[PDB]
Write a protein that binds this DNA or RNA. Sequence first.
RNA 1: GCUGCAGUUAAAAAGCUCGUAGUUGGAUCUUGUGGAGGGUUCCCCGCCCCUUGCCUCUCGGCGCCGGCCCGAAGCGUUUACUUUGAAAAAAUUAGAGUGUUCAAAGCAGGCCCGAGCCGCCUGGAUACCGCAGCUAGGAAUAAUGGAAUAGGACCGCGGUUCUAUUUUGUUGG
RNA 2: GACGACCCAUUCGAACGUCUGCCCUAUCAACUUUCGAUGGUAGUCGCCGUGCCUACCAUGGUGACCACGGGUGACGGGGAAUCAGGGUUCGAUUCCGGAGAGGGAGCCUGAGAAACGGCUACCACAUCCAAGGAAGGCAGCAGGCGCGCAAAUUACCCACUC
Lengths: 263, 142, 129, 158
Amino acid sequence: MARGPKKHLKRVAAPKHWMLDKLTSVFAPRPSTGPHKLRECLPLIIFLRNKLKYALTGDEVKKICMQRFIKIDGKVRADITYPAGFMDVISIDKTGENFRLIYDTKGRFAVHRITPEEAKYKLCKVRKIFVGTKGIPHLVTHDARTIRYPDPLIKMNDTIQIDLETGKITDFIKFDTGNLCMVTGGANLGRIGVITNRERHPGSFDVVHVKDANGNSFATRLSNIFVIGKGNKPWISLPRGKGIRLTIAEERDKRLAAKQSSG
Amino acid sequence: MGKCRGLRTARKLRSHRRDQKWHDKQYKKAHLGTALKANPFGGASHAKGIVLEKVGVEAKQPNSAIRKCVRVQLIKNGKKITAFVPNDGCLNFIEENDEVLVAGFGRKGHAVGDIPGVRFKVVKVANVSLLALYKGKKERPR
Amino acid sequence: VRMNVLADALKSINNAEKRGKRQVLIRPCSKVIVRFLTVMMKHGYIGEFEIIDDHRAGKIVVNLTGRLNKCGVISPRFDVQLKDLEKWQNNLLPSRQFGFIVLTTSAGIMDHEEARRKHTGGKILGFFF
Amino acid sequence: MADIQTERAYQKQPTIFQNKKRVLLGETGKEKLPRYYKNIGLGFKTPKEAIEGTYIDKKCPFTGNVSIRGRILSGVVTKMKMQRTIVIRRDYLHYIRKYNRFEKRHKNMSVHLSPCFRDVQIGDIVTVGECRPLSKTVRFNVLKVTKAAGTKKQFQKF
RNA sequence: GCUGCAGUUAAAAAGCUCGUAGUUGGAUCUUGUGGAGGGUUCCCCGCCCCUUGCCUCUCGGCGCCGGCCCGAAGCGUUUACUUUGAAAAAAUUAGAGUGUUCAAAGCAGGCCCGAGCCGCCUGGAUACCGCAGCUAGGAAUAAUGGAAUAGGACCGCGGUUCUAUUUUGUUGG
RNA sequence: GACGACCCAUUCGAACGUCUGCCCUAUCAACUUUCGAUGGUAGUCGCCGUGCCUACCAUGGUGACCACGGGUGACGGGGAAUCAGGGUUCGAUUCCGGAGAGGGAGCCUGAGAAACGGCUACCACAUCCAAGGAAGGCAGCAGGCGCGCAAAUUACCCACUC
């Protein structure tokens, strides 16, 4: 079957980090088309009945979205399979709560509640600079927003703080060694550490070393690096564990050390 | 040994073994498939036919007996096989020009015991087994 | 001919040890053979050895005891990858408590117990026990 | 060489123009050719022979249009008699997990040869690089030739 | 029957030799001393000539008092080999956690309070994933390799031929 | 607020292309070429690259490292059974990719189809008819016939999952 694009998605080929079961039926939600990559998305309904358990059936989530209590990036969305991804803020204004989508140290989108103050902006990577007609420059970001007239000194692999309401960036970082970074793709995920070094090749990818403040060195491809703030100075509130990432032996030891699994 | 043991002699080994495997007896029946084509079965465990005529086969020496076989033609290949009738007096429970169900002896293409030319036996005469006819758990339906 | 120098050397020392000889004559010398016999001496399976010099390829004379049992060559020279090591070490040694398969690595020629502590595989040469 | 036209259709460089514009020795130049070339990039070197020379070819990447991007490979010459192309060979070793031996296998591939290089001979080492298709059996072009690295073709006694 | 078979008589070496492909192929081109990690010499800096071979430098930091020193830039003839990274769909398999009433399974679940807790805590690991391709370190082993009726080296010079546009505010000679 | 539309970016893909990897057979050893084989030059065509196609021109391409030809109770892979180590055999079948709707060919609509629960024709089948004509494709769920050693209910329902 290949006379056009498919529309079903199974459960057993579903991207594994949404933590689905398999004794519910064959299908899984499928992200609809949008700004983030299909693998990198967390569909809306999985945050609302397969995490926080406001709803219990998919029809219930549709009944929440219809009354429009949900926002994403300060605008109103009303699908059940809206494709939100990394660095967005969800905002329920009927609870007074704001969430942030960020990577756990085990590489899955966690619940990271935040102040309303922080929830007025997000961190956006620059990917492309493109001169349009009549000599105007542009930015292009991973959340796929086109912000016209950027000041010229911003280059790709940099990051920019965006004001959700108005565009028109507040600050930026210029990519270099000794800046604090998060990993967003690759087999490493959610790890935090300073850049330390870069390496360039002519075509065919290139890699970027990273080192943290716990004395571990690891590397990742260039295009999986994301900047979060100046050296040892995050401009976001980080979820617990701080991207350090333990081994399984040490992690076991903590649970049996406090002797705690309930409270 | 008596053979090359280079570090670049993978070809001369892997082509030699693929050739000298054809001289093996088991392999040569399995992979030419002439076994199947020649067999009155398609390679199925059983087969079904219709009786032609009772016969008796006189056993190979030193044993002397009459072994009360049948001869049957098959449905699914239209060719003829001479088939043993097991237990005692189950010749009587077979009646001519009816269907039967046949089955191999248990030695895979080779006559068993002192009876020659018979590589098959009989299990059902009319959806009723020779076991159940003999024991009396069922009865011939007339 | 003599396509494997190491293979012709060891068979001599094998044959000689059986008869009970405690001096032998091995030719041709090669540097590879020297470092081989060095390892075999350190552990204490054989004694001191004398390299006679010519201007051809040398000849070697050895002093040995009955401690040696069997040194073999493995031809051709396979690779080992430090998980393949254990599979080898089972096959060539009569015990888990003694015997040393020898090999060469980029860190030089050594026994297997030592090679595992350098954390480098390499090409296998022979064995002994 | 001075004449390279011999075809039914006129042969020329695109991206070059001929003026009628005035000069003190006109009309209108002194050879009517300002030569075109471009770099390959990547770190491979441009040849003198192109910038000096006169030839029309479009499948060479020095003077023509065709990018080199993706893979890079090598080979050696085995045969040639074809027009602006050659055949080459790639020896390599295939492993078998059932045994522990290797064995030899080779493929042959054609690749286009620039009119820039005019010094090639059988058995010369060559390097090549991935391109968009040029022809049915050509996917590559030469970037560089090298020889005298193993069995020289000449000797010094001068 | 690679690991791991057999060929005098039990089945079995071409009558014999030559010979291209294939397979396989001799020797030969470096050792000692203080500090550091482990013994009582031996296995990250250096020293005898070498030590991650060099320069050349110039642009953007570190220094010390215009002047001087050392990291990054071309790389050590090429491969294999070995060692580390990157990179890899899930289910299955190995395997951590959880009394399914036990198990096969499953991915859950666990805490204190009469009615005042209107709530709290925590999991959903990890391993392996042939090849072939990408990256860095090692340099023994095996291939490949530098001047032999020379060209290697130093800002050593000549002759010959061609040529760059940068700067003297601009444009021409 | 709702709707529509143009271009660029993005998402979902799609399509071509690189390198490496495949079961048996030599009682298959030479094969391929103007009925294009390999290459060159220009053009045609196509969403684009390309002997994809045409004109003109060149004479090549591949092979004992097994081509070419023939065979396969061969859909491919993730896997499965047995097993000390090394292996052997199986994989129609829930995931992923491909191919096809009786056999062939052509085509409309659309962003997307050489679609068959769309259309047009032939060939093979088979139905109705006032004999003038008309209509059809269960390798969708049930069910029946036939084939055979060999395989289920003409059930209930959108509550769950989508």
